[PDB]
Amino acid sequence: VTIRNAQTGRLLDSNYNGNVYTLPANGGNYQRWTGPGDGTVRNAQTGRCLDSNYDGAVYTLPCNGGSYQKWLFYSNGYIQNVETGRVLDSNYNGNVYTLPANGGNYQKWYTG
Ligand SMILES: OC[C@H]1O[C@H](O[C@H]2[C@@H](O)[C@H](O)[C@@H](CO)O[C@@H]2O)[C@@H](O)[C@@H](O)[C@@H]1O
Ligand SMILES: OC[C@H]1O[C@H](O[C@H]2[C@@H](O)[C@H](O)[C@@H](CO)O[C@@H]2O)[C@@H](O)[C@@H](O)[C@@H]1O
Ligand SMILES: OC[C@H]1O[C@H](O[C@H]2[C@@H](O)[C@H](O)[C@@H](CO)O[C@@H]2O)[C@@H](O)[C@@H](O)[C@@H]1O
Ligand SMILES: [K+]
Ligand SMILES: [K+]
Ligand SMILES: [K+]
């Protein structure tokens, strides 16, 4: 289902172009996500895998088995990219990107 930023209240969102962003909850399936158990976080509408790189950019692409598309969900709300180690982040404008863990609330996420 949904992934909601702890700082901004905006939810994790993505489209068929593979662009990612956050928006207020709006019921659409672009805002729900599925975790099979293989490390991936797949968009409920598109089936694509949330993914990022060493530059900090974050997008979705069809799923390819790479550590890049594998995420770790900690109980403190961090969502960590296995390859880079950088943590999923966003800003009130609805930018999504990754940055070094810095303890910030913009790096926390309620996932249900
Ligand atoms: O009208 C389409 C779409 O609008 C809203 O979706 C937005 C966003 O959440 C989706 O990620 C993108 C996908 O390109 O479209 C909008 O910006 C929701 O109402 C959604 O359910 C709906 O189909
Ligand atoms: O060979 C690099 C990388 O390729 C594939 O991952 C794609 C994408 O998911 C990644 O975010 C970017 C990283 O720059 O790379 C591709 O576009 C996977 O085959 C992956 O295992 C591999 O490391
Ligand atoms: O000092 C602002 C901000 O800095 C640190 O957060 C960084 C990053 O995680 C955020 O997404 C962006 C949002 O604009 O800001 C920094 O780049 C954190 O220490 C944070 O608590 C603080 O508000
Ligand atoms: K779209
Ligand atoms: K900090
Ligand atoms: K602050």
Author numbering: 49 to 160
Could you give the paper's own sentences about this structure?
Similarly, we have independently discovered a new lectin, actinohivin (hereafter designated AH), from an actinomycete, Longispora albida K97-0003T, which possesses a potent specific anti-HIV activity. This lectin inhibits the entry of various HIV-1 and HIV-­2 strains into susceptible cells, as well as T-­cell-tropic and macrophage-tropic syncytium formation, through binding to HMTGs of the HIV envelope glycoprotein gp120. Previous research suggested that the small lectin AH composed of 114 residues binds to three HMTGs at the D1 chain α(1–2)mannobiose (hereafter referred to as MB) moiety of the three branched chains of HMTG.
Therefore, it is considered that the three AH rotamers generated by ±120° rotation around the molecular pseudo-rotation axis are packed randomly in the unit cell according to the P212121 symmetry and that the whole crystal exhibits an apparent space group P213 as an averaged structure. For these reasons, the structure determination was performed under the constraints of space group P213 using the P213 data. The second mannose residue (Man2) is accommodated by pushing one side (the C3, C4 and C5 atoms) of the hexose ring into the pocket and is trapped by four hydrogen bonds. Asp91 forms double hydrogen bonds to Man2, in which one of the two carboxyl O atoms accepts the hydroxyl group attached to the C3 atom of Man2 (O⋯O distance of 2.5 Å) and another O atom accepts the hydroxyl group at the C4 atom of the same Man2 (O⋯O distance of 2.7 Å). In addition, the O3 atom of Man2 accepts the carbamoyl amide N atom of Asn104 (N⋯O distance of 2.9 Å) and the O4 atom accepts the hydroxyl group of Tyr99 (O⋯O distance of 2.8 Å). It seems that the Tyr108 side chain wedges between the two Man residues to contact the C5 and C6 atoms through hydrophobic interaction. The K1 atom is bound to the three carbonyl O atoms of Asn28, Asn66 and Asn104 and to the three O2 atoms of the Man1 residues to form an octahedral coordination.
